[PDB]
Every structure is written in structure tokens, then in C-alpha cells.
RNA sequence: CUCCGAACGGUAAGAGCCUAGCAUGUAGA
RNA sequence: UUUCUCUUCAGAUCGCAUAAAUCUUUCGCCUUUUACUAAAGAUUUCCGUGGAGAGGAA
């Protein structure tokens, strides 16, 4: 199974540990479970490709190491 | 110029004066499509014109911020700071109903936890129907008790966080 | 490792040598004179 | 692309020139325009005419 | 303000319940009131007058009039209603009627630490105008 | 045009830029566009097509990566039925849904890396989410974001399908992916870059 | 439909009065179950009564660590919610715990030129 | 057999146009 | 009788426990540094504390 770094250059360095098949609205839910702010407003990016609350995660292919720059709505 | 109604406000003393909404939203707000249009300047009459013509009741869609012009024109009347003679005209209007729903929401984000009872509580009455933008950009048929309800007894009916009114068993215990 | 270093004073240089080429005959410098 | 009259300026995008005009040097001089807030009866007649217009 | 006291009131406590509530609720509406309209500390003038207000009434129901027992006038001060302090600076013969520092000389604090109506009736108020930073005791 | 990368590394950051001297995946873009509007040009009547509407896409439509514009749209001709949502490899097609009159498609080129190989994932992913988002120019509901996989020579796509396209852009994409110009160029200059004449 | 509307205005009406007044009464009958707990663990049965289900929110179902599996916490701020997100049992090796972590030469915690710690619980 | 880490070494430099939250409180006639 | 002010002397486990920093040595690291690891010695800083004038309320 998958580990996840939500990372940020402002004292969030985040480990999440996510889902092989998984959904990213869970995703989001374990980055504020992690984190310490609400679900709706998490958003994640990597150079302004913002993925989706719908789209899966093995859907972009994400595997173990790939740090997304954190960002919040 | 986007900073203060003309050359003074009463400071709501919650958070600040335009300041009550989420800076990240606000921000949000000032980068968008519709401030383009009517931010020439609306202090009391063109806010009239500019609410009715927006059924919408909504705040934050799509992927990106998305600001409805709803969640927009409400932070454009914070940022005019109208007397609340007018905000009680428009709480007591039946022919429009977003214009009543805009007088509720910033009576419940500018005004007294009293006053916002004694001004909020014949908005339960209404049971007709309210659209509203959810986040995913689909919209919904809300019913207007369901709102007063979600605005407060839970917290951010809309993006906005909520200035933590108080329970109704206190005021029951020492006032109306 | 002190490599890096040399190659990015060589860029300096370089990129402060194309910034004085561009703005000695710039529009504002020579196109500007040139309507002069 | 966008060109003002008065600005004497030419924007080359839509809301980069959308935010120039809204607070502008030359639409300074063009008149202050600040936000009056009009009396308590001005939205009265804000609503009644719109109400007879609009609607009827 | 009546928040708690871990324990009973004592048994002559029906009778302060109506002028000291009056007095709280002026409290309340006092701190909560808005800052426009006071200049730089306009707002912190009333506040002592309500203050001012609510040991007078407590002196005067101490033992002036001697209507107070002994455990009212220790417990009121026990709990959060009056300045056993203040009381005591107004035990002195000097120390009349003033607030806490507005027109006083240099005390251990840089501006004054005395009184607010400290300064004299005959001599203050320099020409005609009087008035007080902290106060307002003319 | 050089996609990212990752860390400094000023040594594969001026072979990239070295890789795409001029504006070339504009060119690569025009390119392709121009190759998709001649296929469906072969075959109009029998397909339906009413014109050829290509869209005046912005000059950085093809590097730019957080929006999905129309690349070419088509005008079918009437009654033109629509396939599901399916991939250009699946071959049991579901041939129920809705009816357009327009049909949009977006060439994306991405520029993949070992955790990229899979072609079909980004493309199902950048078009479900211009589908998604209430942000982009997208005039018709139903269309594709045929990929293609510069640095691996991969290609894929997936979205709304035509009647009897699947087979017809699948021939399409193996006759433009390969023998294309531009293709040939980048081959030519990476081959160049890296010291291999073979 | 405006007789269908004044209908549901009541169920909500109902829901809404019934969601104060069950508010209200939650708090006496919070320390009501307190006090039938109370005479409950008093003189209800010398371990013969539970009347309980041990309920929890969001149960941590671990597994076993391989050899030297990171410490993966949760993170301890939404657990109220009880969401279906947290129940998938994280005892898995994440990025190098897929390894044995004992066919290595004698140690290998990380090379990463870095190795301030010094632990492995051994003793 | 539960010991779990963060920053820098990182984002070429560029000429034309445009928009703004902030700051003094005075000497003197 | 009770407290607040302060210059002053502490080798009492000054405090029936327990924080950090600086310097000098010794290990583990190490890609550069700052953050570091665990052992010894010393100097300071902070939460403080003890015993003796004088001056202010009950």
C-alpha cells in the first residue's frame, strides 16, 4: 500500500499513508486527519495540475514518494 | 479601491471589518470575473439592482475557488457597511427572496446574537424553494427552513466560517 | 562540488553580460533614439 | 487588444484590463467616485420601483 | 457579575440582588459598547464611574448605614463585586472621592498613582479646564 | 515548450531546452491538428461530419497543462448518436447515450516519465477533469483528450465516441504518431543530443 | 404544489422542535444514565451486568510490524466523525519496508548520512 | 517489536503596459 | 499578627526533581551548514528557593 508525502515549504511536511485503488476525497480526509484543517478546504497540486476530489489515485499513478505541493481553498 | 465603505467603519468586533470572511476566499473573491463588473462603486440603491437579478444562494464551486456572485455581492454589502434600517426592510420583504436571504445572512455576520434571534426567527416559516450551487458545480433545491437551520444550528452553511453565536438555552436563562 | 559553484558565476556572468547587450541598444536606448 | 480612451493605455488580456479602470490614475481624475452611502428611504425606492418595473 | 462562588450567599443576600444586577447590567452594556465616538480612552472613563458606583453603594451598605453584616461586607469583596484596596484608601481622611489615578503628582507610576479627583478644587483645573487622562474627576 | 522536471539539475535542464529549440511543441500541435483535420477531412459524409471547425486555440494551448481547450470541434450532421466513455484498445463499445450536434478534441502531449508509462491513466485523468472543472472553455459535452507519450512513444485516448471512429482514429493515430514531421524532428534532434548515429 | 409544501413544513417544523427539546433533555438524561450507571455499577450484579456494547468510534485494527516498519500515527484530529477512510488497518509496508530487513549484511536503518538516532529495541 | 525529521544547497535573466494593502501627525508665519 | 517593596549573604539533596545554551574532549553520523546522537568536565540563562536592614495596610 502506498505512502503519500502532502508536503509544503511553510511547517507542513505531511506523511499519509494512502490507498492502492483509492478515491482522493479519502485522500483529503487523511491529509486533514494529519494536518489539523477541515476536508473541503485541503487542495492539492503539483505546478498547477489540480487534481480532483473525483478523480482516483491510481488514475494519475501515483506510488510511494510522490510529494504534492499543498495549497488551501 | 476596495478597502473600506467610503472613510469609516464600525469595526465588527468579531475578526474585523472586511476581514469576517477567510482571507484565502476573500483574495479569491478580488481575483475573479465578476469584480470586474459592478466594483465601480455600489453604497446603498445599485446593490437593490445588482441582488434580484442572482437566484442563486451559494458560495464556493469547482475545483478552483469558484466565488458565486451571491458570496461575492454579500461581501461587496460588508464591504459598503449599509445602516441596518435597510437590512430590516429587506429582512421583512416577501415579493424578493435572495434579497431577504442576503438581509438574514449579513444580520447573522453583522448584528447583535439578540438581534439576530428577534430578526431570524420568522425566517422559519418559509417553506418554499432555494437554489443553491453545490461544490461540484451541480446545483440542488434547498428549502429555506433548511437553510435558517444549517445557518444556526451548524456551522458554515456557506464557505464562510461562522462567528460562534451562542446557544439558545443561555439567553433563554437570562433574557428572550 | 565546487563545480556548481563555477558554473553559476559563469551564468551570472553570462546572464549580466546578456542584460547589458539588450538594454545598451534597447528599445528604450536605441529604437528610442532612433526616432531621434 | 483592450484600449482606454482616457487611460491613454492598452491592456493585452481581459481581466488584467478588468482591474485597471476599477481604481485607476486617469479614472481618479475623471471624478471620486466613493461609495455615498444614500438614506434609509433610498432603498425603499430601490425596491418599490424595481418591484413595479421588473415584476410589473 | 454572579458566576460562582462554590458555596451558599449569606443569609442577607435577597436585598443587594436588585441595584447590584441594575449596576452589572450597566457594567455589561458599558464593556461591550462600540469605540466610535471615543476619542483615545473615552471609553475607560464610564467604566470607572460604574466601578466607582458599585463600592459606594458597598461601603455605603457596609457600614455607613450599617445594614450589611459582617459576612456581606467580606464577602461581596470574597467574590468579584468591589476593591477591598480601594475601600481602604477610602478609610483615609484625605482620601475622600476620586478614582484611582487621573490627576495625581508622580507616584510609583511615571504619570500618578493616587487619584483621579486627587488634584484640588482650589488650585487644579489650570485657568478653567478640567479634566483627567484616566477619569475625567474634574 | 520543455514540460519540468524536477530538483536544479542545470545539466539535463539545457539538454531539454537544447531538445526544443524553438517554439516546437506549438509546431508539434499544429502539426497534429492540421493531421487530424485532413483524416476527418478524407472522410466527411460518411462519418456525418458537416465542416471542418477547428478552433482558434490559444498560442500556448499545447504546453499549458492545467486547462483542456478544444483542439478541433466537429460538426456532425443530424441525429448523430454517441458511444459511452470507453478506451481506443476496448473493443466492447457501448453505443448508449446521448445525441450532439458538436464534438470537441483536445491533443495533449505529455511528456512522461517512468511513473508515467501508462497512457490511457493520464488521459482518462486531464479528461475527466476538464470535464469536471467549471473553468475551462467547452463548448461540447461530448469529445476526446487523445494523448500521446513524447518521451516513450506512447499514445492512447479515451472520451466520446463516434460511430465507426474508433477503428478510424485508431488507424489515424498509428499512421500520425508514426511518419510525422515533427516527430521525425524531435527523433533527429534527441538522436543528435545523445550521440547515437546509428 | 403549495399543499405539499405547507405538509413538509410541518416535518420540518417537527424535526427542528424535536431536535431542541431532545437537545434539552440530553443533558439530564446524560446524567440520568450517569445515575442509572451509578446504582448500576452500585447493586446491579458483582460482574453479572454489562448492558454495554465498548463502543468506539474508529477501531484501530493493527497488524505486526515486519522488522523495522515505520511508525505510521494516524494523526489524532478527526476521529468523531467516525469515518469508513480510517478503518483500513495500516500495518503494511509503505516505500522499503517490502524488503526482509534480515538477509542484509549486519544493520541497514537508513544511509541517508543522517543517522542521529540509535535504537532498535532490543533490550 | 512501534525511533516518526525539517530548512538551505531549487525554481534563468529580460525590455513595453497596468493595478495596491501600507506610512507623517511637525516646525513656522 | 498578615502582606508588597531590595540594595544584601547563600555551598543546606539552597529545589526528596530536573530545563536549555556556550566552551573543551570522546563516539555515531556525515553531501555543505544549521537542526543532531550519547558520555565526561567547566561557565552562564531561565521556573525558583533560603536568611538579614529600612520603607508602605489590616
Known sequence: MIEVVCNDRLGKKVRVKCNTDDTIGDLKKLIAAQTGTRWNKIVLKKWYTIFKDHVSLGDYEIHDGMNLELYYQ | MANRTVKDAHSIHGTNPQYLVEKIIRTRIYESKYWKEECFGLTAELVVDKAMELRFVGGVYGGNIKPTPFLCLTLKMLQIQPEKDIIVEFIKNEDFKYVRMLGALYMRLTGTAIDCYKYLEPLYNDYRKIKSQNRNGEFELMHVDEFIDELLHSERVCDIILPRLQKRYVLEEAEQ | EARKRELKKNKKQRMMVRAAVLKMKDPKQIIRDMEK | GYYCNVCDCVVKDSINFLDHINGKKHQRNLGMSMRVERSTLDQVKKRFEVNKKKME | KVKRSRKAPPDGWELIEPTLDELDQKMREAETEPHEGKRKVESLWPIFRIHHQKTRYIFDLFYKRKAISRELYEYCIKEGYADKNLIAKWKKQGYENLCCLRCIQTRDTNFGTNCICRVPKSKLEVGRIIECTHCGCR | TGIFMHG??????????????????????????????????????????????????????????????????????????????????????????????????????????????????????????????????????????????????????????????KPLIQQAMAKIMKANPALYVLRERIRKGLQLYS | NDEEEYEAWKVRELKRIKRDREDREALEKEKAEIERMRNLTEEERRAELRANGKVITNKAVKGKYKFLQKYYH??????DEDEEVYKRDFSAPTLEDHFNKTILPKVMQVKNFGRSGRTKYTH
Request: some cysteine; glycine content about 4%; aromatic content about 12%.
Open chain 6, 8 to 165: 536544479k539539475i542545470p545539466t539535463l535542464k539545457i539538454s531539454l531546452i537544447q531538445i526544443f529549440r524553438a517554439h516546437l511543441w506549438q509546431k508539434i500541435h499544429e502539426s497534429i491538428v492540421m493531421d487530424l483535420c485532413q483524416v476527418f477531412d478524407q472522410e466527411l459524409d460518411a462519418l456525418e461530419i458537416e465542416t471542418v471547425q477547428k478552433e482558434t486555440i490559444h498560442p500556448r494551448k499545447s504546453y499549458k497543462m492545467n486547462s483542456s481547450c478544444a483542439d478541433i470541434l466537429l460538426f456532425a450532421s443530424y441525429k448523430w448518436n454517441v458511444s459511452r466513455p470507453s478506451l481506443l484498445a476496448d473493443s466492447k463499445d457501448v453505443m448508449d447515450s446521448t445525441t450532439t450536434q458538436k464534438y470537441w478534441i483536445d491533443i495533449q502531449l505529455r511528456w512522461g516519465d517512468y511513473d508515467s508509462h501508462d497512457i490511457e491513466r493520464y488521459a482518462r485523468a486531464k479528461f475527466l477533469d476538464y470535464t469536471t472543472d467549471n473553468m475551462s472553455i467547452y463548448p461540447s459535452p461530448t469529445g476526446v483528450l487523445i494523448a500521446i507519450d513524447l518521451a516513450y512513444n506512447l499514445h492512447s485516448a479515451y472520451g466520446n465516441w463516434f460511430p465507426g471512429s
Open chain 7, 74 to 79: 494516524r494523526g489524532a484530529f478527526f476521529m
